[PDB]
Subunit: 450 residues, 4 copies
């Protein structure tokens, strides 16, 4: 045993399940909002020898040693972050977060004291749990256990941010930080609006560029670097490895400076994390060079044009859509007026198009909508003529659930309907086969084999 | 643009630094204790297409969909983790989603302890990690010390072993809710049954950190903490020779007439998700499961027994050169040389051997901001098929390297001037070039796990 | 030296200032809302030998010994509390709080965990600080430091409790306890209203009977013992010594019981306090027997009739009045439409009628109204014909401040106006003399001498 | 109804119990340490018309109005407090609004410490109060332990003195923000300069509790803590022979070129109001100021020297009867008899002497839920013009009373049965009646401060 044997011959049991997943990602049209298909160039760096380097430290201030190469890869991800997200090196960025969720908790540990107060878009309102979600029976997110805070909702019959129930709940809550983060929100954030709301309440505003990372970088969608520190994930829209970073402003705000400088750096290490995943830091810096290319500018223009083409086709098929339309990479289809809901995701799962339940902007265990994300298959060189091609397959998939829902009542029986009916089982097996035949016809980033 | 281009031509600027570090890992003698060289089989799965699967959920309990195949790597990683440390699945459970060892430690705190509850951990300048609860005398630095109150338990400064007396004493005076038997820089073994008797007298949860001894415990090479602890956290890398991730081992099953249950299973699983993390790094989950099956093989046992034999040969050789080792010696994978009797501190050595391409780290010796010792790690080069005869050759290179720094200390005074002395002195740099190149010729001659090119 | 010498001969320096205060309390018409004049029978028990008894314990569960007499005085205050505030001994009461503020913090330590959440009427909205008041620069009340919580406001152009901004801010805050407490609020609390709001939000509702203690006891004003635990002070309206108590429901709410039982008893001791002020517990129990008398029923009917007579006379004099009128013991005069404000209290201070600034229901350092309390001089056998007699003296006092305000700008100069003008100094010296001559003509509870 | 009726005719039901307790205070030998008999001059001011003055504010900084005269009692109470303990007003300040000693202690915590900061205090079963931070091994009971984290510092169990070694040790391991030199049941004196060296090595605020030694310090009878402490809290009653209130003493004035200031003045004043309290109990503020001027007189010095002489005569007499005293003896106002060598616990004695009209309290002796000793207090009867010859007569009555309980223990077993034995046994009750009545004849013969009638 040497340690350089092939995965196919060292452990064929895992090689089995590795390329069975590569099959399913090519066999199916992944329309999950948070999902993307990383490039081979970044996937090669993700599984590189940089995993064998413990670099607990910082540029010039490392507690270890021998981090010669890792230092310049360290700063290059920073330089590429300042170049993919313009502005004078006036701005600083930290690239050590293990993912997007640790990036949000890090900024809280950096700027907020324990049990300090936050404002955040509720998870059933277009956010993730990192934004501060307590349930009415239990505290769910650690951002809600270590920091007390209250949800920030949007207009339930308009789909845009409710700035009336915002300044109201703000003056009555006086938090130290609010979040303008998006997980399921189809339009644009008014940055200048909430910035002065944050000084009326004396709060810092933080967003999540998780679903718009590449949209802001290619100047296709507006950026916060004149109206906001704000954190983001590496993947989803930037088409990279699983990591995260935190964008903080540096310099003056003698004049008063900006305090968002070394406390964020101190929060990710040595406060919350330890060894930087240097293989991920380099993998994403390859995708950070991807973000400075003209192809990425055209790819990003493709994802919005495709998200609007997906919407306009979804619009004509008889679907109501919260928000009114779309101005991002995502769709928030409202299926309740069409007799469908979010949970009855299982039907399209056995057809091999992966979606997710989404909180209905205004309903009452069963959600009422679902969330589709364009950039996943748009990375497969999809087009708008192929983006109304998707819609007929979603329209066909809805009709299978719409008919079995009329033949049942329970949903423990609705999902068992697709298993024992042996007639809908004929209809699903045939439906996925053409979805598999269609999905396999487009290129797929990454390795041909794994 | 297709997305399947080679890294060498898509970004030659990173291909530049990718094999320049692969050179430096072959170019240098990595003596860091926490560092290892992962296997090629795991690196292929680590940078696989499993990064393109968002599986926010749990095996069979996922809020998303299409998780048919991606689930099976999780449950197989579960079974392989319970098999690498010989735990029958009806008595023990394991969670394989922690992104690393630090999120794994904080997850157990959020799972069993309430905010501002009390923790006890070996102090960092005494052999512990930051996740164990380390405050400075001016500031709380680690998040385990901000969200949870904590107090250190130090060692006997003239014994080098964990003072298990000043632990049970101050525990009765502190009433903590969880104690850690976790080690980052300590050359001997933790008396787990001892810490078991302290943890049930005060009613506290006992957690260990197999971070530096995971594979030593996996090969049954050293006594295990899975019989004297309720929780056990570990890293997937370090001694286990895997990807950078973490695990959490919790006991399941049975613990008036009615029986006491076990509460850790569903509280730990809730802490890692949806409380603290989000998308599970499945590319790492599969990579560490690949190193988990290798870890159940007789080859991994032989490797782990070699790590001990090499760590003791490195220690016994350093002893004869006139060096001091706290605790007296070693029974694990690491050495903790005390450089104070040799007229040199921890930091100034760490710079000398760094520019010679022997990677060490400063370590604080019981006594005194600038340390006086270093931490040497066997499992890094033991994975390079090193032997004891090749591990006393390393020691002579360290002994020769110390004398280079020991002489510049006589020619300088400060340490802002000590580090620029080793750069411009065309005579000590000439002596450095011979030692650095000769270590390179020695280090480059050994095999290296992973891709030769990547 | 024996220890039984008279205060007049042992320390004449303090006897001087003791009977100079008894002069000023008789020489002036105390119209402070929180103020009352205690009876001699209770004042005698307040300075009794019960100060020399350390009774750290509880009925039958005392850690000390020899508390034979103090036990029956202990329970008698309880029995008199259950008799002055009817209902089956279904209800329990704790009589150890040192005052009213420690009573509120005790119920929080009893039912709430540290940093749990509260809802409370803001201090500038009719509450005290015990209700949870944070300033926009500093946390002021300890109820706001040990428990995070947010204010509960009222309708700013109606004066009644804003139940729209109540259920709104409630669902978005999900606290464990809300307060319905009054310090400056002229009307009645809808108890049944907020009780079900407290179960929609899953919160306990606590009030402060501080300004209505005797009004609820004589059945003149509605009680909470069917729609609420709720704490109160001993004095203000009950005309007793300075202490406090906490009223908690006992028994069932097998059936689920009420948890408000031994945790309140544990919070006042041994958690927050120590030695019970037994001299105060007995002094107030004398005033608790006062609350079961027909005279107290007629006295309480006098305070409301006088508060409405004071209002109706204040109404006709050209004063606007928030809330619309009055249904309690208090007045919340709105002086801004009359060119006066709250701060310009100094004028009537040198005239010897003591008032206090009150937060204007809707203004912008200088408040805009003041708070008068009827039960203070109503204890001096005042009448309604004597309660419009007050109004002309308040009307005259306003006109002194209204004219000097036109002759100055600053208020550091407005208060120095009444010192150096030597013409308004003639007008104030003459004004207080007839106020002193009028106030001295009525009986005064307590000792003739001290 | 006028409001000026006599208590005897307005409520004869309370006049019933008012002089029935005044009887019982003359009827019995009050041996409680914390208890004293307040002066008539203070009782007149305590139940004065100053209860009818709401003065939410501070001398010169009141948010209300008409506080002309009521202010002057405050500032005079300030001056008299600084004069009773010899503190020049430019170096020390005092706050006179705390309702008692417990709100005074928590006020200093809210003033200088943040929530969940750390406190150190002598454990309650070791000689401390609850305000010092006492948690049980199952529950946090005192509010000082819920809002602030804390840990006890115990005593040497075979010395009876405060272990100042296991204090500076565990302090370096605990990094507290404030330590207390406060005592509730400890017969010797606290080494303040010792606790001063521990409190500045860890940078912590040193606070004392003169609760049991306020008047002993006021008469300069025992060494004072006003030279080795930044804060000092005290009760107005107990040894100071005043009304039930509290005080807080903080240092003011001066503590690179620039000088260090003192931060306690405006932080302490803000904690007592408007943070924690509301209306100042001015009737108590004036009452304690009356006892504060008496405390600066040679009569109060003679009384305080007598409290020591009587406490030592009580101790030396108990020693000869075959009783044990922890610490060895006494140098303050209290005795801590250890009843375990006499075959009897703390609780069962406390019942016997209670029904004989000698008031004691159970006290836990270093060793073991049901104590084994009691706490005897001199200043209660020393205020009744007691002498040492009259304080060994008390001891013989305690010695005789113990033998009554020592024999019933041989005739019963439980303590639910021990307390009903002393009630229905027409033979031990006959022996109790002689001892109780003869203590009554002795106790009734001494003067009593306060009203004879009230
Ligand atoms: N066994 C063990 N366990 C582990 O876990 C471990 C290993 C190996 C790796 N690992 C895991 C990774 C270990 C990570 C780690 C460790 C310790 C500290 C720490 O705490 N050091 C302080 C000094 C740190 C300190 O003063 N920080 C100041 C900065 C002040 C400054 O920069 N300059 C001032 C200027 C003042 C003037 O103007 O005069 C000066 O001159 O001092 C602050 O934060 O404020 C100390 O050594 O005590 C740490 F942070 C981060 N082995
Ligand atoms: N030097 C000193 N300092 C002072 O400050 C001081 C003095 C003199 C006066 N002062 C100031 C006043 C002192 C105030 C003070 C003191 C101690 C405790 C305390 O903490 N005691 C616990 C037992 C207390 C305890 O178990 N409480 C249970 C109740 C459980 C129960 O009632 N029954 C169960 C049934 C179980 C079954 O069904 O089996 C049983 O049987 O045990 C709880 O709270 O849950 C102990 O002694 O350790 C205290 F609370 C309150 N002298």
């Amino acid at each position: 045993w040497t340690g350089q044997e092939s995965l196919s011959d060292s452990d064929p049991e895992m090689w089995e399940l590795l390329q069975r997943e590569k099959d399913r990602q090519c066999r199916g049209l992944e329309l999950i909002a948070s999902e993307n298909f990383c490039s081979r160039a970044a996937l090669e760096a993700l599984g590189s020898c940089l995993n064998n380097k413990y670099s607990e430290g910082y540029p010039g201030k490392r507690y270890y040693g021998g981090a010669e190469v890792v230092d310049e890869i360290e700063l290059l991800c920073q330089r590429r972050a300042l170049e993919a997200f313009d502005l004078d090196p006036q701005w600083g960025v930290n690239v050590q977060p293990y993912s997007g969720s640790p990036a949000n908790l890090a900024v809280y540990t950096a700027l907020l004291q324990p049990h300090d107060r936050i404002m955040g878009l509720d998870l059933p309102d277009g956010g993730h749990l990192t934004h501060g979600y307590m349930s009415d029976v239990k505290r769910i997110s650690a951002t809600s256990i270590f920091f007390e805070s209250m949800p920030y909702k949007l207009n339930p019959k308009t789909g845009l941010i409710d700035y009336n129930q915002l300044a109201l709940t703000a003056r009555l809550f006086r938090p130290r930080l609010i979040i303008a983060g998006t997980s399921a929100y189809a339009r644009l954030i008014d940055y200048a609006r909430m910035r002065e709301v944050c000084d009326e309440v004396k709060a810092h505003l933080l967003a999540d560029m998780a679903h718009i990372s590449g949209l802001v970088a290619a100047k296709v969608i507006p950026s916060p670097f004149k109206h906001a520190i704000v954190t983001t994930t590496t993947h989803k829209t930037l088409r990279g490895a699983r990591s995260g970073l935190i964008f903080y402003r540096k310099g003056v705000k003698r004049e008063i400076p900006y305090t968002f400088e070394d406390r964020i750096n101190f929060a990710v290490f040595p406060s919350l994390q330890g060894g930087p995943h240097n293989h991920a830091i380099a993998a994403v810096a390859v995708a950070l060079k991807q973000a400075c290319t003209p192809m990425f500018r055209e790819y990003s223009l493709q994802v919005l044009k495709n998200a609007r083409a997906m919407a306009d086709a979804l619009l004509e098929r008889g679907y109501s859509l919260v928000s009114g339309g779309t101005d991002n990479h995502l769709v928030l289809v409202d299926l309740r007026p069409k007799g469908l809901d979010g949970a009855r995701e299982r039907v399209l799962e056995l057809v091999s198009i992966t979606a997710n339940k989404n909180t209905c902007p205004g309903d009452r265990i069963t959600p009422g909508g679902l969330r589709l994300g364009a950039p996943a298959l748009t990375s497969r060189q999809f087009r708008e003529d192929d983006f109304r091609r998707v819609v007929d397959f979603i329209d066909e998939g809805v009709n299978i659930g719409l008919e079995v829902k009329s033949k049942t009542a329970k949903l423990q029986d609705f999902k068992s309907f697709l298993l024992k009916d042996s007639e809908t089982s004929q209809r699903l097996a045939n439906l996925r086969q053409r979805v598999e035949q269609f999905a396999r016809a487009f290129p797929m980033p990454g390795f041909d084999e794994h």
